[PDB]
């Protein structure tokens, strides 16, 4: 078995709830354990980041 524990990752100034028609949990969803980081607005410059664990 596997033991899932949060990495406490949190971000400021981007989108973190990307969705896609493939991962379809009664609507456009994504991987339950992952985050699809996107720019705040379309085409907007994405900020360089560095997260550790």
């Amino acid at each position, epitope marked *: 078995g596997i033991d899932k524990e949060a990495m406490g990752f949190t971000y400021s*100034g981007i*989108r973190t*709830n*990307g*969705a*896609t*028609s493939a991962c379809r949990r009664s609507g*456009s969803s994504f991987y339950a354990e992952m985050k*699809w980081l*996107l720019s*705040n*607005t*379309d*085409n*907007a*410059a994405f900020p360089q980041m560095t997260k550790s664990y």
Partner: antibody
């Protein structure tokens, strides 16, 4: 059922201020980013401003920076464009226009436009 | 940063095919998506093409989008013109977050 309602248009003089509003109904307003796009009479379209889904980011046209200020109230589903220190050229029809992915990448094309509110600035 | 230049006007006989160009002054046309908008007199604009070639639900098969990386342009083409198509057309691309509109192209169908 999805619609955008521009309000607050009228005739003004230069140097004064104005405020515009857009009423959104028929879709998840809180998720898409919203844009202000105008068009002077006999002229073509010109993108004015945009604000993100959560108001964190606001992007203005270089020809309008400093004067206009965009804002939104998601609890009221309303868009606001603050056009203070107006000029003569700002005379145009003003459309509110939703334009954004909205969290989804498949994203059938969703780009609604209102009917546009006339803003005449004569002396 | 850049500007999109499209011809001031174009005309062609009904039933014939017509193409409208959209040339980007600085930066690759493939760097950012290009949307094609149709504006009829007095009416609000309606998107005819999005993401360089995608035909939204409702637009007939006559409308097609294309990219010419060589001339750094984007072309909107209508086959079998009809008098309803007589409107202004604007191409729009993206600077980093800001939208950029073309100069407009008055398409008149010969009557």
């Amino acid at each position: 059922e999805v619609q955008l309602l521009e309000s607050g248009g009228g005739v003004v003089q230069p140097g004064r201020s104005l405020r515009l509003s857009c009423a959104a109904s028929g879709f998840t307003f809180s998720s898409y980013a919203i844009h202000w796009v105008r068009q002077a009479p006999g002229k073509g379209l010109e993108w004015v401003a945009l604000i993100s889904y959560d108001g964190s980011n606001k992007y203005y046209a270089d020809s309008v920076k400093g004067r206009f200020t965009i804002s939104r109230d998601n609890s009221k589903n309303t868009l606001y464009l603050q056009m203070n220190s107006l000029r003569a050229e700002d005379t145009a029809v003003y459309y509110c226009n939703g334009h954004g992915s909205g969290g989804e990448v498949g994203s059938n094309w969703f780009d609604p436009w209102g009917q546009g509110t006339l803003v005449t600035v004569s002396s | 940063n850049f500007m999109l230049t499209q011809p001031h006007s174009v005309s062609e006989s009904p039933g014939k095919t017509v193409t409208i160009s959209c040339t980007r002054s600085s930066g690759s046309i493939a760097s950012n998506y290009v949307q094609w908008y149709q504006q009829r007199p007095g009416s609000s604009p309606t998107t005819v093409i999005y993401e360089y070639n995608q035909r939204p639900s409702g637009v007939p098969d006559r409308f097609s989008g294309s990219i010419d990386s060589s001339s750094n342009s984007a072309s909107l083409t209508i086959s079998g013109l009809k008098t309803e198509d007589e409107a202004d057309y604007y191409c729009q691309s993206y600077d980093s977050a800001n939208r950029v509109f073309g100069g407009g192209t008055k398409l008149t169908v010969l009557g």
